[PDB]
Amino acid sequence: ELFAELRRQGVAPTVVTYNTLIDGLCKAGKLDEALKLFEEMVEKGIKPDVVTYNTLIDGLCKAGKLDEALKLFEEMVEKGIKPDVVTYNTLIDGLCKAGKLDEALKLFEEMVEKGIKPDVVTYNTLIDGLCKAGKLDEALKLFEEMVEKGIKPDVVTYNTLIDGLCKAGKLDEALKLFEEMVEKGIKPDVVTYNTLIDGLCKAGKLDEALKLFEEMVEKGIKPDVVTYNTLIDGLCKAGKLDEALKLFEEMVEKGIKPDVVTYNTLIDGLCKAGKLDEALKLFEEMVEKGIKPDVVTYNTLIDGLCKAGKLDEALKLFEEMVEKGIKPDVVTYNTLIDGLCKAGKLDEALKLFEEMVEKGIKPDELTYRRVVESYCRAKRFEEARGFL
């Protein structure tokens, strides 16, 4: 509202004010209103700049609308508004996270071709894409390459590689790398410790994780919500749910405020244990304390109910889910498809795939495998061949 008022008087809105606003709308979520602000400013004769483009482009990548981001990239190049190292960083990230690492490497080549030097963020972004694509190998290569270029690895560089190494099973390497970053002027942070803690929990070394938690508290590094979500998931997975609820209480007492992941993590643990009551209790409680269940909450509950054989209840939560405006995803659909299919409700399952395709959700491997399976033991085999 302050905008109209500022206009009203004699203050001509800058491009930075529109950029600030558009960023706000792109974070707050509402993308299409951001686009609308873009058109409004274009109209008023205020020229969108390279920051305007980068902002919208980022927001479109993170709304899943990649190809639209690329439309905007095209458009900015048409206008002579030259993409900069940030434009390319944004797009490289967007491509890596949409499973198009090869195209990302393309943009990486191209920016150099245009006299744009990759910076520490470019490298961090690619080392992350590389790791998450299984290519630890290439990631470390890149880590050598950036030092060759005189670009100084930062905390994010080390955090990224510590994580990749953990995820590949190489806990010992991650630890040695942690030591290396300390032996340098790089002070680890909450993320370094959170990453290491997660790595220790995943490898079944929960007490080493708790030790490390003590050490970060000692070293003056305040644990955050992620720290506690990580230890809570570790305890639930280790089968120690009492202790996890204890840590939950404890974080509330330490002034850490549980978020949606805290609640999903607990709901998962309780569902997996078969304590579907306590789980539903926490679902209602989170809504009560005003923490909006997302798609993972409902997915988690639905899978808990299907696994218990409470199909009706599960389906019901799917309905309530939609009615609350919560948009399903491929996980929701794989879960119900799976559950229906186990129940000899292959027809409905197929219908669920139909709807899935009709709302604009990609089916993914598991969906394919699953509906093929169900089509088979049915048994309509030509029906499956045509479905693929």
Next chain:
RNA sequence: UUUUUUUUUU
């Protein structure tokens, strides 16, 4: 004023 790392669901 915009871009990179850690935790939860099939």
